[PDB]
Design a protein around this ligand. Structure first.
Ligand code: D5M
Ligand code: D5M
Ligand code: MN
Ligand code: MN
Ligand code: MN
Ligand code: MN
Lengths: 220, 218
């Protein structure tokens, strides 16, 4: 493949941890063209200012009704619960959602790469499982993906620590992240850390991006 | 009165575009923020800015127009045809319509679009963009109302009705970041959360079919 033209930052909130065979409760996508990223001002200072998000971005944030209740742990940090989602008429992960996801992705210049923090262990496998439950073919069969933990790890060692979203943000900017544990809030925080070294991050992504189709489902 | 029953979903909308009506403008940015009726159920002088509901669906998209933006437009919206192309944004197309259609499908009916000055700007303009597509309009079953009339009505109960003017008057605070589709949509949500029940009742009473909105130009 060539250079990724669009980076789609992703975060999912769910009913719980992998062992519980969790289901998605919230999903946020933030598509950013590589030009927007390489155009972000280089960070200067220690700590440097938090990068300014690009003006031109595409965003999607959706709350989804899970097939089962959230565990006390997931609900307390995400602020979501099956009862509230359902009473508010949220629908399950279905064909229409897949259609919506495909259309959102098609608005972006290809090739495109999904970027998620701990995505290789959580987000990508979970999304794969959710899509596998549907009848239609996956809309991500032409999309690439990459875990931002590995990326930042490389970027930091090139410039043992916790590589959690908030820990990295705090390490780099000496500032506290906002709206943690909400799909949009975490996506916005991820965007900021990936904007730390724009050029280096883009290059690393280009070198490590892999087909989402190769992602193994979290559970069958 | 409920000419169309109680609205179960209010979709706050705002469009940024190339220019003013007489320019046969094209949309450059679009944002939809769908809130369930239950969510709107959320004394100070002035009161604090209402917190937005936790559960919400949001869509914000940038769009490349067929022509350049007027300096005045580009200056306040921060968008320009050149940059939108550099960022590889696509024109208003059928895929966009399909996206809106699927987004709307996720919301419980009936749904009512809410836009500040929507009756004169957003709705007519939206109708025009969709009308010229191959895909039939995905909003023919959706309702709409202008928040300007609504806030005038609510304020009647105890001069400038621009989005920014109303927000400040009510909260003695400046809106987060105006002239950006999402920024203006969130500000609109806030002013509509001023008097929730009253706003909801007013919307239920004045909602009309978006299908009856006449396009801005052909
Ligand atoms: N402690 C605990 N209990 C149960 N479920 C959890 C916990 N920590 C994370 N998660 C699950 C539920 C979250 O929505 C999701 C992503 O976390 P995020 O990091 O915000 O993207 O991971
Ligand atoms: N001064 C001026 N010149 C050209 N075009 C303009 C101007 N003011 C508004 N507009 C057009 C372009 C904006 O994106 C749109 C909606 O503004 P909104 O704020 O959301 O109502 O109206
Ligand atoms: Mn996450
Ligand atoms: Mn999260
Ligand atoms: Mn407007
Ligand atoms: Mn606006």
């Amino acid at each position: 493949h060539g250079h990724m033209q669009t980076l789609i930052f992703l975060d999912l909130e769910a009913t719980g941890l992998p062992s519980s065979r969790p289901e998605v409760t919230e999903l946020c996508l933030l598509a950013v063209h590589r030009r927007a990223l390489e155009n972000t001002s280089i960070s200067q200072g220690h700590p440097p200012p938090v990068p300014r998000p690009p003006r031109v971005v595409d965003k999607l944030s959706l709350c989804i009704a899970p097939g089962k209740a959230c565990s006390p742990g997931a609900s307390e940090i995400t602020g979501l619960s099956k009862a509230e989602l359902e009473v508010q008429g949220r629908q399950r992960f279905d064909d229409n959602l897949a259609i919506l996801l495909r259309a959102f992705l098609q608005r972006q210049p290809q090739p495109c790469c999904l970027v998620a923090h701990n995505g290789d262990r959580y987000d990508f496998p979970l999304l794969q499982t959710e899509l596998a439950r549907l009848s239609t073919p996956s809309p991500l069969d032409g999309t690439f993906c990459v875990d931002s933990i590995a990326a930042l790890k490389a970027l930091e060692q090139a410039s043992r620590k916790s590589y959690s979203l908030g820990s990295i943000y705090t390490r780099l900017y000496w500032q506290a992240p906002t709206d943690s544990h909400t799909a949009e809030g975490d996506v916005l925080t991820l965007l900021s850390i990936c904007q730390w070294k724009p050029q280096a991050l883009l290059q690393w992504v280009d070198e490590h991006a892999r087909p989402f189709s190769t992602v193994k489902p979290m559970y069958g």
